[PDB]
Amino acid sequence: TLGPVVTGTSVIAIKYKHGIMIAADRKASYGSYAKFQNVERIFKINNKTVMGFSGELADAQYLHELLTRKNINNLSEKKRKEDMYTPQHYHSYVSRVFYVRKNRIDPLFNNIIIAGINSQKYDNNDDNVLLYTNEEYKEIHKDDLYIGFVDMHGTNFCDDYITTGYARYFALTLLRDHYKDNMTEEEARILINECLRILYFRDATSSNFIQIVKVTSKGVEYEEPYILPC
Amino acid sequence: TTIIGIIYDNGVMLACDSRTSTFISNKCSRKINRINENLYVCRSGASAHSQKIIEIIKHYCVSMKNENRKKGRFHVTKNKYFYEDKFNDYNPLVENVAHITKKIIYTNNNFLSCALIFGGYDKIKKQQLYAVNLNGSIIEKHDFAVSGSGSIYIQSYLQDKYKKFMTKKECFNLILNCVKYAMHNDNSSGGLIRIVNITKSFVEEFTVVNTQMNFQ
Amino acid sequence: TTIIGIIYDNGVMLACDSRTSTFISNKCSRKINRINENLYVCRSGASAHSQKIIEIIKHYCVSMKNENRKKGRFHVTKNKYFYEDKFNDYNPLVENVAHITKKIIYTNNNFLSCALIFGGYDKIKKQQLYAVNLNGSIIEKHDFAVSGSGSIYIQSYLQDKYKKFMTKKECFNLILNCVKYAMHNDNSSGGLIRIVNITKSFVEEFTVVNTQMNFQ
Amino acid sequence: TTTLAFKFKDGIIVAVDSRASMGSFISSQNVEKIIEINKNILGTMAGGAADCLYWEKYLGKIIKIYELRNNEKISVRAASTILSNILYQYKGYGLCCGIILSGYDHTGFNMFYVDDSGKKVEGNLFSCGSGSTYAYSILDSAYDYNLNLDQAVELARNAIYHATFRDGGSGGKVRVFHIHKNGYDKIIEGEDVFDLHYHYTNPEQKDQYVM
Amino acid sequence: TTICGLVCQNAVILGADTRATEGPIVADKNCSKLHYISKNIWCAGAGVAGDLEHTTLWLQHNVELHRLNTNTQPRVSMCVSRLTQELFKYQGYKVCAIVLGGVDVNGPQLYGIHPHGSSCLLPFTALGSGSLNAMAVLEAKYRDNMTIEEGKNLVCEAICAGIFNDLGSGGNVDICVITKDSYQHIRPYKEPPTIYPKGTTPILSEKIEYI
Amino acid sequence: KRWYPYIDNGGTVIGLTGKDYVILAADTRLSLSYSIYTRFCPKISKLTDKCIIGSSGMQSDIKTLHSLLQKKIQLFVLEHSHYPDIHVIARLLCVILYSRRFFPYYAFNILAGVDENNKGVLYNYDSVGSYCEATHSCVGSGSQLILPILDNRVEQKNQLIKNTNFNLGDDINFVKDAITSATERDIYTGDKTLIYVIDKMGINVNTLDLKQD
Amino acid sequence: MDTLIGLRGNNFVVLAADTYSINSIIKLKNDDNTKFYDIHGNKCLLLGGSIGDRLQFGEFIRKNVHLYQYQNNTDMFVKSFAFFTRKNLAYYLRRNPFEVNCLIAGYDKKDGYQLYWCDYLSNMDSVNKGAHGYGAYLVSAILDKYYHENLTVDEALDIFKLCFEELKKRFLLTQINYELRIMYDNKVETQYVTV
Amino acid sequence: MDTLIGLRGNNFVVLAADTYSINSIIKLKNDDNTKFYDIHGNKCLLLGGSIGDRLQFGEFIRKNVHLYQYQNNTDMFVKSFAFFTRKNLAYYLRRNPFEVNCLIAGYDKKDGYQLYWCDYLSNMDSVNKGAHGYGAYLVSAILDKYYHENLTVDEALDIFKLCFEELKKRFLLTQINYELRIMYDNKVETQYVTV
Amino acid sequence: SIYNYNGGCVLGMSGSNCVAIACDLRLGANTFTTVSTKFSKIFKMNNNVYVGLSGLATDIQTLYEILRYRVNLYEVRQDAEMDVECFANMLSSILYSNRFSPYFVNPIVVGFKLKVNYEPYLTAYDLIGAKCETRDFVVNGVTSEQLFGMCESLYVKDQDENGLFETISQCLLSALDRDCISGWGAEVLVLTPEKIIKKKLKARMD
Numbered sequence A: 001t002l003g004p005v006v007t008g009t010s011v012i013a014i015k016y017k018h019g020i021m022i023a024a025d026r027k028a029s030y031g032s033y034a035k036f037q038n039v040e041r042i043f044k045i046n047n048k049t050v051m052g053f054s055g056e057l058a059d060a061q062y063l064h065e066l067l068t069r070k071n072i073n074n075l076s077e078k079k080r081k082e083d084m085y086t087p088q089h090y091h092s093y094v095s096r097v098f099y100v101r102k103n104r105i106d107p108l109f110n111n112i113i114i115a116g117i118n119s120q121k122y123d124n125n126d127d128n129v130l131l132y133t134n135e136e137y138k139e140i141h142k143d144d145l146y147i148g149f150v151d152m153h154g155t156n157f158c159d160d161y162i163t164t165g166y167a168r169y170f171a172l173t174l175l176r177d178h179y180k181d182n183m184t185e186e187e188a189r190i191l192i193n194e195c196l197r198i199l200y201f202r203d204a205t206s207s208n209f210i211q212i213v214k215v216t217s218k219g220v221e222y223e224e225p226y227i228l229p230c
Numbered sequence B, C: 001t002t003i004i005g006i007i008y009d010n011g012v013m014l015a016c017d018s019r020t021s022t023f024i025s026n027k028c029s030r031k032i033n034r035i036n037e038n039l040y041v042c043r044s045g046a047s048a049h050s051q052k053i054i055e056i057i058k059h060y061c062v063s064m065k066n067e068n069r070k071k072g073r074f075h076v077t078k079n080k081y082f083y084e085d086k087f088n089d090y091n092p093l094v095e096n097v098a099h100i101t102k103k104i105i106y107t108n109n110n111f112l113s114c115a116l117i118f119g120g121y122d123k124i125k126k127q128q129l130y131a132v133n134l135n136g137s138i139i140e141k142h143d144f145a146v147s148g149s150g151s152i153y154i155q156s157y158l159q160d161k162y163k164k165f166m167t168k169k170e171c172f173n174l175i176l177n178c179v180k181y182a183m184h185n186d187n188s189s190g191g192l193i194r195i196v197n198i199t200k201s202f203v204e205e206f207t208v209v210n211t212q213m214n215f216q
Numbered sequence D: 001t002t003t004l005a006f007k008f009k010d011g012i013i014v015a016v017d018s019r020a021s022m023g024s025f026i027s028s029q030n031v032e033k034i035i036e037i038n039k040n041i042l043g044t045m046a047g048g049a050a051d052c053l054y055w056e057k058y059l060g061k062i063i064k065i066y067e068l069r070n071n072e073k074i075s076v077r078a079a080s081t082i083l084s085n086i087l088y089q090y091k092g093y094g095l096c097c098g099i100i101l102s103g104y105d106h107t108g109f110n111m112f113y114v115d116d117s118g119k120k121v122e123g124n125l126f127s128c129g130s131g132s133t134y135a136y137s138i139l140d141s142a143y144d145y146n147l148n149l150d151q152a153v154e155l156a157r158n159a160i161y162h163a164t165f166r167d168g169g170s171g172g173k174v175r176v177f178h179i180h181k182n183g184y185d186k187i188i189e190g191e192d193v194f195d196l197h198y199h200y201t202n203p204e205q206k207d208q209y210v211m
Numbered sequence E: 001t002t003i004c005g006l007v008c009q010n011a012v013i014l015g016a017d018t019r020a021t022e023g024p025i026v027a028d029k030n031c032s033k034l035h036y037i038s039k040n041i042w043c044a045g046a047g048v049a050g051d052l053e054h055t056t057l058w059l060q061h062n063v064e065l066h067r068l069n070t071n072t073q074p075r076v077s078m079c080v081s082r083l084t085q086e087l088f089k090y091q092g093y094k095v096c097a098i099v100l101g102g103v104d105v106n107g108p109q110l111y112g113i114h115p116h117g118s119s120c121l122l123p124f125t126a127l128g129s130g131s132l133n134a135m136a137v138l139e140a141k142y143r144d145n146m147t148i149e150e151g152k153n154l155v156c157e158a159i160c161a162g163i164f165n166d167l168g169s170g171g172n173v174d175i176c177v178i179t180k181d182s183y184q185h186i187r188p189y190k191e192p193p194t195i196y197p198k199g200t201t202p203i204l205s206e207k208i209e210y211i
Numbered sequence F: 001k002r003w004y005p006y007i008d009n010g011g012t013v014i015g016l017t018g019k020d021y022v023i024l025a026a027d028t029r030l031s032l033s034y035s036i037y038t039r040f041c042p043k044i045s046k047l048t049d050k051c052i053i054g055s056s057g058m059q060s061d062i063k064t065l066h067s068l069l070q071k072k073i074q075l076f077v078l079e080h081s082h083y084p085d086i087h088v089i090a091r092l093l094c095v096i097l098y099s100r101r102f103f104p105y106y107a108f109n110i111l112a113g114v115d116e117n118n119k120g121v122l123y124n125y126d127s128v129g130s131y132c133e134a135t136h137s138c139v140g141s142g143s144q145l146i147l148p149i150l151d152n153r154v155e156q157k158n159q160l161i162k163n164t165n166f167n168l169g170d171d172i173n174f175v176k177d178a179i180t181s182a183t184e185r186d187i188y189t190g191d192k193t194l195i196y197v198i199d200k201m202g203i204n205v206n207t208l209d210l211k212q213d
Numbered sequence G, H: 001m002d003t004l005i006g007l008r009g010n011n012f013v014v015l016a017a018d019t020y021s022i023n024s025i026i027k028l029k030n031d032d033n034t035k036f037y038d039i040h041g042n043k044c045l046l047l048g049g050s051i052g053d054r055l056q057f058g059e060f061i062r063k064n065v066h067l068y069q070y071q072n073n074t075d076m077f078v079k080s081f082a083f084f085t086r087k088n089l090a091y092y093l094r095r096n097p098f099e100v101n102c103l104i105a106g107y108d109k110k111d112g113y114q115l116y117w118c119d120y121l122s123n124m125d126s127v128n129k130g131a132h133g134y135g136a137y138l139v140s141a142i143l144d145k146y147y148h149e150n151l152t153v154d155e156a157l158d159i160f161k162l163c164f165e166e167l168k169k170r171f172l173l174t175q176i177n178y179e180l181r182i183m184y185d186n187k188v189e190t191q192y193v194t195v
Numbered sequence I: 001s002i003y004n005y006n007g008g009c010v011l012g013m014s015g016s017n018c019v020a021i022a023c024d025l026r027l028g029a030n031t032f033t034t035v036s037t038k039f040s041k042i043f044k045m046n047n048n049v050y051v052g053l054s055g056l057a058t059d060i061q062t063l064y065e066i067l068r069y070r071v072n073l074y075e076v077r078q079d080a081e082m083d084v085e086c087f088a089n090m091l092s093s094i095l096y097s098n099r100f101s102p103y104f105v106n107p108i109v110v111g112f113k114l115k116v117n118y119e120p121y122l123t124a125y126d127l128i129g130a131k132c133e134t135r136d137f138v139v140n141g142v143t144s145e146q147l148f149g150m151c152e153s154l155y156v157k158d159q160d161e162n163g164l165f166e167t168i169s170q171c172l173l174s175a176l177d178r179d180c181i182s183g184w185g186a187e188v189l190v191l192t193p194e195k196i197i198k199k200k201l202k203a204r205m206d
């Protein structure tokens, strides 16, 4: 990949009391042309791990295929729920992939978020895994939650909230001002919607048509996509 | 940017988006500029270049209007203005202003990259649309003109829906839908839609908030 | 070049122009290529690159079809062909062929500059459109896909006229008018219009001579 | 950088400054620019410090293997040939080395200049680095084969001083080693050249010296 | 640099940080970026240090000349026209991104002027390296009709966001509240060693001259 | 346009030797151009109980290099049954850095430690593997600011009246003053600094908040 | 390629230069006379660089200083001469530069014997010793080593002999023939030294 | 910059070269010995160009011709030696070229005294006289003028003296020191000529 | 790279009822050859106005000549000494008049503003006259980073003349010891309202 052609815009992931909330608009732009407006940019890796991307769609799809087969091979060797790979394992794997491709000067034109739940001590969802078919949410400590960033050069880290693309300026300012630990689902949703509203007004490559995904004790849940209210 | 002009039975409607500049520096802009009470122009291309062209041509139009005066005595939110010059005694012709703009653009077409759509009314040729292209060529359009990045996405659509003698209502609907579709498809165009309807005796400027709904 | 695909009730139509290359090297070309009896693909971009991609993917499709066979016994000018594989027992899935094409394009996306639209029918997902973009990204379109230089000129027009459950007749009219408008506006597209209608049990291939008439 | 070496009546004198810089910034002034290749061979550094250090230690490894296999001390000529061939094999990859290899072997005292371009030149007097021309001028003005050890050491110190005085790339401390038939001695382990200016050219120190 | 401006009821509020950088190095920790153009017009600059200072001085004194000749209160649109014509006179060079805020008979007017000579009347804007950080806070919190104190608070929040998120922004918060009657320039609005022995430095000479 | 494979993530690492101790203080800011990725990304990695490495440059290269050196040290311990001292690790780091001579790690490194004889030791490294021992060093964005300060305090070359008697506490406070000055004058240095002290009892870590602007 | 050398003591100034005229790969002359420009009133401008630029700038400065001295009927001071030369060289620097290197020597009663070093960028300063050309790299340290304030003129000429011998021995261009201007005791003397 | 000269008569061949080793602007040696490569059996390869390439190609060709002669226990013919040298130089021309200019001299009973001129592009031919380097431009015509087939070796050395004097007088690099190989009467002789 | 040809650096510092300026004395050539060790970069405009010009030596001399011309004309016309702030604004205007063909110089201005009260005045410039006034210290030249670090670490507010001299001298010398293309002597001027102390430091010659 010489450069970006079909590009996805920002992704915003945050920790809240029941888990991870990760958001991205469903738009992929062909330069200034808003060619595709119902694209999925948050991918499920496993029941406690999701991946989001900003940048080139082809590279992101290639990475998604890699992580899909990694999860399947992990599932084949599994005997207990602790053998499932964690989000930090996938973050390290993606960081290594980006690092090697940087070394050979064949980068994936992407910024990647790998988010999820590190701990197996909250549910038995991995005891009997279903890949082809889908009580209250449990409060999860932030130490057991994981959000990790990777860029083109392989610069990799983790934090309580992560932003990619234009969200690194617009959303991240409001996040650093207003984020607090142990937010409810409603507060996290309101904060994310405010960030996406600012991005919709100021990022030309964004759209108001949002996809929200939640990683909680009951696994990965894809919310129905919605237009930004007001 | 999307800028559109359409001649209908009793006037000419111009329309534009409001978005300026991946980062949106401004979302409430004025791409339609009032040169004279009977003459407006839509901009596309480099912003400073086009804006200084607007100032120069306003100066030219004011000079022409002052010189045109003969001696003696003779004879959805809208904002409406009636022409002070009721009989078009001294308002400059739309062709004259469009052609001096073409001359200025062509003389400086080494670096100027600006495409303009003049719309207006005078008593000689009634309502007119002129398109001044990038290198300083002028073409009079008798049905419609379109320019900017977004306009391409609506070309066939406008060509499908234009009628020779549209009323005010259906021309307004057509031009609004055209700018809405162009904004939906083009990232570089967005924000509130400004429309200017120019007629025999008045000009009315509309502002429109917009949303694209489809279940295609 | 203009290439279009539209999904309608129990079918998928594809359509293309015939012009090749200011000088027209060829005015009767085949941009729609038969990969399998239930699967066609439209090309746009570099010609040799796309054609060799078609040859490679025909080889892959033949290999997949031979491997898909189970052991034992079971159970305006048009040209119509009925599927030999009536029950879709061993014809490759459209997703599989589109995805291996995406893999080959992405692996060689340094130099390959080709955008494809796969259209076809299988028993699992019924009729499908897939768009393989320039860098080797694949997006399944459930309403329509468009690509090539001319398609931009009709982007709003198709978006205005598409309906969720069009009949064969109105989808045929829509896709024909879309390619006609694209040819009218785009110099790089012209000539006779080729259309391929893919259904549950057969494929029709239409050839159309065309002319754009308007008093706009 | 300034390095020099010259042959004289009682063996070889080698001398160096100790400055290392990154463009205009002085990165260090404690650099050791003379490497013990073996007990009888010394090697200088000029140009790329990484390449000089790595390949001189690599040459030391090769020489250790050779001497252990053959039970015999290698000659300066053979070590210089090995280094020149190694550096020539990386021609075009941007290696930057200017090295003076000087020592004593069974054929007497020998001295070779070798650089990254495969050069290999036998002589009795060499200087390398950005201040090499100044040291050459001072040495050629004052060099005599029959200098005593003190005279030769003082001459090397003076040449390094004048090179550091004129050259912005050279400075820090002057080191002067003496190779003889039974190893080498660090006659001047390290001497700050700040004092050498107020010894040689401005001993009275009542005013700024005017060049 | 982070600079911002907004329009509140019968007033404009400009704000800026107080960091000037020589590339990675902070060259001035308390630089003043809000510039006087007239009693009822102020501006801030986010471009080539020199061009902004000299353009602001030129605009200020030419506006004073126009006021003296015509006797009328200066207009913001006149400053916009003069600035844009001067900037377009040079083909994109003499880069000056300006936020120009004033109050005249037409009301409070805030303009963003680009280095190529394009102006834009705005209700609020921000400029500089930390422009996007400020615009996040402004777009989140701005409303059409606000008191002067609320506008001051929002300006302070925007400039603090730029200070804490943009590496090219830092220091104190400057603000200027411009009204028709007067202006209030609050420079310190918000603020988010060894002694050597005498004679330790060696000297060669000293000379005492009495004034 | 060809993609440039190097980026400077910024921040400073200061090192200062004692007689029988060594101090290594590194800021934790991680930045890209004029934006901040995160305010906490440690630059210092433990290698043994008496040796650490800090680095400044590209964070991906720094992380990979530190993990590589750790893996090779564990391999050394398993194979040769003794922990390598700082000089062995120093030659190992030189060889590792020179093995990528024509596509180097985008990192300048300081290896700090206490050797077998209880001497503070500090090696500094450029990208390609040239290295040398020092009594004080600095790498990263703030290095040109801090190296004159360390020269003035430690060596006192241009001072006739010399106070050459330093202890651990004064060295700690001086390193704090140095990283504070770097934070004041360097945009890329700030937020927080981790200060490692190595002495006879081993490694001890302490934190100091710095300006966040 | 044009080696220039200058040495100033309390009771003299001495300038020296190679006497080669170069045209591509051939020495047109071994007795070039386009480098020294003697001005009336104990003044000398020794120029390096391109021969055409040397001729144009040297004659320009000479004809300007002579015009000054005849118009005013006085001898221009050496400091005024040197700074006038630098000012004119810097005036043309941003408009058709003279690619010439300069040593400016003279004697005044106001300031004694004077030497000024000035490069093609018009960066000038007064010096006790100086050099220009690639050969400067091989002579400057010699001038640094053997110079002292109370040199006699013969000792200075011995230092110049050391410089010429080093230029023969070590410099790539084996420069053999040299011309020398000796200003001392209110007389200007020309000498020619081979090897 | 490395001047090489060669002259072949009926009863001799003579090669000559300046004995200078250059490193940027400084002559490392005035008695360089990295140009001549004497091969066993009345053969000489005189190389020009960069010193490292000279050493590598020279040493290479020498050890390749010695291996041949020891493996086969015969002296390689001069024609075979020259064409082997050209073939190896041309082999590396499109893969890491040796930027070296060659004169290849020798004696055979089969073909008498032989001289071959060969450039860095491996363009080779037998010649009675030849030259390499910039100094070739100043010596070749002299070799054209005073040469005749029945020259004695002393007359050839007088011609080389004329060439050396012209290289001193006119060439920009005043080359003073020269080494000469004289092959005649079944003996190979070394001479050193200053000026 | 144009500033690397000659090198050079200038510094200024303020104390209580006293101010100081300082500079290195090298004139280099082609970034590595030292050709003079008395090239002072400090110039007196008047008793309360001094300017330190670092950068290309030809532009240093040209700008000093222009400034001397302008100051002498101003003072003879007005029959009074030029105010230091007036001089600083004039220097800004002169540097900006050559915006597209600038003198490659990075000046500082050091002096006393008169109000009789003598307030210290320090300001630093870029090549096109963008000036920043400071209360503590000013730096320009290729050694700017080292000088910034030294002054940030060692500056003490409201020092007397001796303490100011020691602090500015130590800052300059420590900064110069880490720079290849500057040094070879150091001039230090200390102005007080009654007198000036000019000193030459025993500096390194590397």
Ligand SMILES: O=C(NCc1nc(-c2ccc(C(F)(F)F)cc2)cs1)[C@H]1CCCN(C(=O)CO[C@H]2CCCNC2)C1
Pocket: D020, D022, D025, D026, D027, D028, D030, D031, D032, D049, D050, F008, F056, F057, F058, F106, F107, F108, F124, F125, F126, F130, F131, F132, F137, F138, F139, F140, F141, F143, F144
């Ligand atoms: O000299 C500095 N410190 C002390 C150091 N001495 C050395 C060193 C010195 C001498 C030798 C040898 F010859 F004796 F072998 C070997 C190594 C390396 S470090 C800093 C001066 C400013 C530049 N600098 C930076 O770190 C800037 O940041 C880099 C990080 C990554 C790449 N981009 C910018 C280093």
